[PDB]
Design an enzyme around this catalytic site. Structure first.
Site, short mmCIF file in Angstrom:
data_model
loop_
_atom_site.label_atom_id
_atom_site.label_comp_id
_atom_site.label_asym_id
_atom_site.label_seq_id
_atom_site.Cartn_x
_atom_site.Cartn_y
_atom_site.Cartn_z
N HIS A 54 0.82 -1.19 0.09
CA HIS A 54 -0.10 0.12 0.05
C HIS A 54 1.03 1.19 -0.07
O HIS A 54 0.29 2.53 -0.19
CB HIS A 54 -0.92 0.09 1.24
CG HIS A 54 -0.26 0.19 2.45
ND1 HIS A 54 0.06 -0.64 3.46
CD2 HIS A 54 0.03 1.76 2.97
CE1 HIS A 54 0.47 0.15 4.41
NE2 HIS A 54 0.43 1.41 4.19
N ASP A 99 0.02 -7.52 1.99
CA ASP A 99 0.53 -6.32 1.84
C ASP A 99 2.10 -6.26 1.67
O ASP A 99 2.62 -5.97 2.74
CB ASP A 99 0.14 -5.49 3.15
CG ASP A 99 0.40 -3.94 3.00
OD1 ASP A 99 0.67 -3.53 1.90
OD2 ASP A 99 0.30 -3.20 3.78
N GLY A 188 3.39 6.89 8.79
CA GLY A 188 4.87 6.87 8.44
C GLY A 188 5.54 5.71 8.86
O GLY A 188 6.65 5.51 8.29
N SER A 190 4.47 2.48 8.11
CA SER A 190 4.15 1.45 7.19
C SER A 190 5.31 1.08 6.22
O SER A 190 6.15 1.91 5.96
CB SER A 190 3.11 2.03 6.28
OG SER A 190 2.00 1.97 6.54
N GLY A 191 5.49 -0.29 6.21
CA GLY A 191 6.65 -0.91 5.42
C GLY A 191 7.69 -1.18 6.34
O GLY A 191 8.58 -2.00 5.66
#
Lengths: 240, 54
Positions: A54, A99, A188, A190-191
């Site tokens: 995402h 994801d 911020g 995320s990932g």
């Protein structure tokens, strides 16, 4: 892999704390071409970074490694161009399931004291409910700018059954929950990584994915379950 | 009536500056979007938000 040259120190991201500089050396910041940090990621070797699907990364964004204080110019950071983006084809924009995205760098990262790889698990590894793990990133510290300095938090893995008591059928097999314990991943983050320390080595168990729209610290965060996606990771590396 | 849709951050943990049309205040307004599950009232630029509402 998974052994920082600079030992992290934890007290045992909202309500997190400041990382020892350099202590999470697989942590990268994904920045756009105007220089804004939008997501995190993790080095899994010198050529590849794993992040969340995402995050919508393109070859226009860059991978920044070796960073601690984004407001500082005294850090020997690596601004690494992305050659190609591989989003997991099974990524579901509806449920945010699967994801995960891989990034192959145009030129290899140079590993150092402050830049090195996290370990990946085997598909059959078991990370038990209740295990205390760690997540890190430059997401917001209160639900507005992202913090300059790298944050970390310790937090427990939840069973999927218990996670469902909060989130119901939104929880899929390719997800794992953690938190609801006084800390929260936030915008911020995320990932970036959720790591658990297995055998003296930090191993990537989760990828920061989704959770409370207000970063509530009493609800579980949700993470892409790496054991469920790591066969796809290895086949992607092998074929490209 | 897309501008009548409410500010939706969504549940993803991304940091994506965007703009939405606030009804209460009647302006185009900046907010942090998480990157997923957004609705229509979500624009990349303030110019872009104004140049479709106001």
């Amino acid at each position: 892999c998974g052994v920082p040259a600079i030992q992290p120190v934890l007290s045992g991201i909202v309500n997190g704390e400041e990382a020892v500089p350099g202590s999470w050396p697989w942590q990268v910041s994904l920045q756009d071409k105007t220089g804004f940090h939008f997501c995190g990621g993790s080095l899994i070797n010198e050529n590849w970074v794993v992040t969340a699907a995402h995050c919508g990364v393109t070859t226009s964004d860059v991978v920044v490694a070796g960073e601690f204080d984004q407001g500082s110019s005294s850090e020997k950071i690596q601004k690494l161009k992305i050659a190609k983006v591989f989003k997991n084809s099974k990524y579901n924009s509806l449920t945010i399931n699967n994801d995960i995205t891989l990034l192959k760098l145009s030129t290899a990262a140079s590993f150092s004291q402050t830049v090195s790889a996290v370990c990946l698990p085997s598909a059959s590894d078991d990370f038990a409910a209740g295990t205390t793990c760690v997540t890190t990133g430059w997401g917001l510290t209160r639900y507005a700018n992202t913090p300059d300095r790298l944050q970390q938090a310790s937090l427990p893995l939840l069973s999927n059954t218990n996670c469902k008591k909060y989130w119901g059928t939104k929880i899929k097999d390719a997800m794992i929950c953690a938190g609801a314990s006084g800390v929260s991943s936030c915008m911020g983050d995320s990932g970036g990584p959720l790591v658990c320390k297995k055998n003296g080595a930090w191993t990537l168990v989760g990828i920061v994915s989704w959770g409370s729209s207000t970063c509530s610290t009493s609800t579980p965060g949700v993470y892409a379950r790496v054991t469920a996606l790591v066969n796809w990771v290895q086949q992607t590396l092998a074929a490209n | 009536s897309i501008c009548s849709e409410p500010k939706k951050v969504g549940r993803c943990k991304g940091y994506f500056p965007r703009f939405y049309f606030d009804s209460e205040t009647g302006k185009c307004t900046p907010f942090i979007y998480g990157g997923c599950g957004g609705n229509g009232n979500n624009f990349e630029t303030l110019h872009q938000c104004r140049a479709i509402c106001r």
